[PDB]
């Protein structure tokens, strides 16, 4: 029972640590969106970074 | 009778040791409240610690 409760605590910890990792409201580790596109050229062409949910 | 009186002294000792374990007026070992919630995120989301009365 003690080992199970330790396991459960650690799982809840993983969840908290994962959902708090936002910068400026946008994040690539929670799983909110599928990809983020940044500017890479003075004409609008983008640099694509896929989302890696953890 | 001597062993019984020893037992009674030790029980009274446990009670005193338990009710004196307060820091800043709040404690999680006396049984006064059901849980304590601390800050864990800059938006108010909490870290919950249940109460383990002893």
Descriptive notes:
- This is part of a larger assembly, with two copies of chain A (54 residues).
- With 54 residues, chain A is an alpha+beta fold.
- Chain A has one helix spanning 2-19, and strands at 35-39, 46-50.
- In chain A, strands 1-2 form a two-stranded antiparallel ribbon.
- The longest helix of chain A is centred in the N-terminal third of the chain and has 18 residues, at 2-19.
- Chain A is rod-shaped, with a radius of gyration of 17 Å.
- The interface between A and B is small, with 2 and 4 residues.
- Identify the quaternary structure here: part of a larger assembly
Number of helices of chain A: 1
Order of helices and strands of chain A: HEE
The two chains with the largest interface, and their residue counts, are: A-B, 2 and 4 residues
Helix/strand class of chain A: alpha+beta
Task: Please describe the biggest sheet of chain A, giving its number of strands, its sense, and whether it closes into a barrel.
Answer: 2 strands, antiparallel
Determine the fraction of residues in helical runs of chain A and give it as a percent range: 25-40%
Beta-strand segment tally of chain A: 2
- Compute the separation of the termini of chain A in Å: 28 Å
CA-based gyration radius of chain A: 17 Å
PDB class: structural protein
Keywords: flagellum, flagellin, filament, helical, Caulobacter, motility, structural protein
Entry title: Caulobacter crescentus FljK filament
Chains A, B: Flagellin
